[PDB]
Amino acid sequence: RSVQWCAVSNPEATKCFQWQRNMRKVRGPPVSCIKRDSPIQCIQAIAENRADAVTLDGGFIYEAGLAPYKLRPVAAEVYGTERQPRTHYYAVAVVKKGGSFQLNELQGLKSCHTGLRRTAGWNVPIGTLRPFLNWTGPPEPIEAAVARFFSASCVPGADKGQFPNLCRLCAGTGENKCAFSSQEPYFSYSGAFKCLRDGAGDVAFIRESTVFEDLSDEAERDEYELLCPDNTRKPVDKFKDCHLARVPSHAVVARSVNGKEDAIWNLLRQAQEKFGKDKSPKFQLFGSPSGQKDLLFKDSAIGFSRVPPRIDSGLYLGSGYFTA
Ligand SMILES: [Fe+3]
């Protein structure tokens, strides 16, 4: 048999093939590759059996856990260090040092988000900012409220059609502008951070580690700072004390009925021992070629953690809390 993996892009498919070929050479548990174009296509594919697994950000574990998919998280990615490992991360608001505006004075500013309906880039900041959005609930789409709040933004995935302001700072070329893919350079964590660094925006909504990952030199990282919820600004290393929310890690999702939770688990368990962190000069399960990022799994992940059975998206996600 084979656990069929779901890729949301060619480079992700490319890496999937290499993964398959290395599991073979090593005589390990088999993996196969399906190529889709988005988290949704993969969510359906799995639901309808053309695939078994895909790693998802919390806002998508949310959407999958719903009918008609009823998908369930199976393994969580692990962050941190081997020494201090964790299966959650911090949604922060990163800004340029020098400014004076606080979390509560963002009206009319320009923003950079990881992507529409993602945790750190959308769901968390938007729920936080809500008391200032003056949003006249349904039927009125939140994006409509958001577009009138920030002057211009980069929200990979937003409907440029009805919300051009949300795609305004985006850097993609042509039809790719504001695409929820890597064809849009300001997509995801690293791209949301680049949008801040390029000075397209004033605030980037990302996770804690991005600045450390994207900036090796400690000097440069001193140019940045974070917006805390008590309306203060703190240095970058202070995320523990200054964050908008604490969130469960991205997780591998599978069917709730005949998902193959066990095959998936053994494949991940062995791939991690064989090609995990610092294990093989030939293949890195957590590592992307230059130009790409977070292909299949997060690049800085150190491993996986199995999620106990029958545990639904609901309880998985219920782990998190909005800055209290
Ligand atoms: Fe995330």
From Swiss-Prot:
Tissues in which the UniProt entry reports expression: High levels are found in saliva and tears, intermediate levels in serum and plasma, and low levels in urine. In kidney, detected in the distal collecting tubules in the medulla but not in the cortical region or in blood vessels. Detected in peripheral blood neutrophils (at protein level). Isoform 1 and isoform DeltaLf are expressed in breast, prostate, spleen, pancreas, kidney, small intestine, lung, skeletal muscle, uterus, thymus and fetal liver. Isoform 1 is expressed in brain, testis and peripheral blood leukocytes; isoform DeltaLf is barely detectable in these tissues.
The residues the record assigns to binding hydrogencarbonate 1 are 114, 118, 120-121
Location of the region described as Interaction with PspA in the Swiss-Prot/TrEMBL record: 17-24, 35-36
Q: Where is this region: Interaction with lipopolysaccharide?
A: 17-27
Q: Where is this region: Involved in glycosaminoglycan binding?
A: 24-29
Chain positions of site Important for iron binding: 207
Keyword list, A-Z:
Antibiotic, Antimicrobial, Cytoplasm, Disulfide bond, DNA-binding, Glycoprotein, Heparin-binding, Hydrolase, Immunity, Ion transport, Iron, Iron transport, Isopeptide bond, Metal-binding, Nucleus, Osteogenesis, Protease, Repeat, Secreted, Serine protease, Signal, Transcription, Transcription regulation, Transport, Ubl conjugation
Record-marked site positions (Interaction with PspA)? 1, 10
Describe what happens upon changing residue 118 to D/E/S: Disrupts anion binding site and destabilizes iron binding
Q: What residues form the catalytic site here? A: 70, 256 (nucleophile)
Q: Which residues are glycosylated?
A: 134
GO terms under cellular component: cell surface; cytoplasm; early endosome; extracellular exosome; extracellular region; extracellular space; nucleus; phagocytic vesicle lumen
Name all Transferrin-like domain ranges.
3-324
Please name every pair of cysteines joined by a disulfide bond in this record: 6-42, 16-33, 112-195, 154-170, 167-178, 228-242
- Protein origin, superkingdom: Eukaryota
Please give the residue ranges the record annotates as the region Bactericidal and antifungal activity: 1-7, 17-27
Q: Name one GO molecular function term.
A: heparin binding
Q: Where does Fe(3+) 1 bind?
A: 57, 89, 189, 250
Q: How is it modified after translation?
A: Poly-N-acetyllactosaminic carbohydrate moiety seems to be needed for TLR4 activation.
Report the record's Gene Ontology biological process terms: antibacterial humoral response; antifungal humoral response; antimicrobial humoral immune response mediated by antimicrobial peptide; bone morphogenesis; defense response to Gram-negative bacterium; humoral immune response; innate immune response in mucosa; iron ion transport
What binding partners and quaternary form does the record give?
Monomer. Found in a complex with LTF, CLU, EPPIN and SEMG1. Found in a complex with MPO and LTF; interacts directly with CP, allows Fe(3+) incorporation into LTF and activation of CP ferroxidase activity.
Tell me the protein family, please: Belongs to the transferrin family.
Query: What name goes with this protein?
Result: Lactotransferrin
Q: In the record, what lineage is assigned to the organism producing the protein?
A: Eukaryota, Metazoa, Chordata, Craniata, Vertebrata
Q: Which residues of the full protein are shown?
A: 23 to 346 of 710
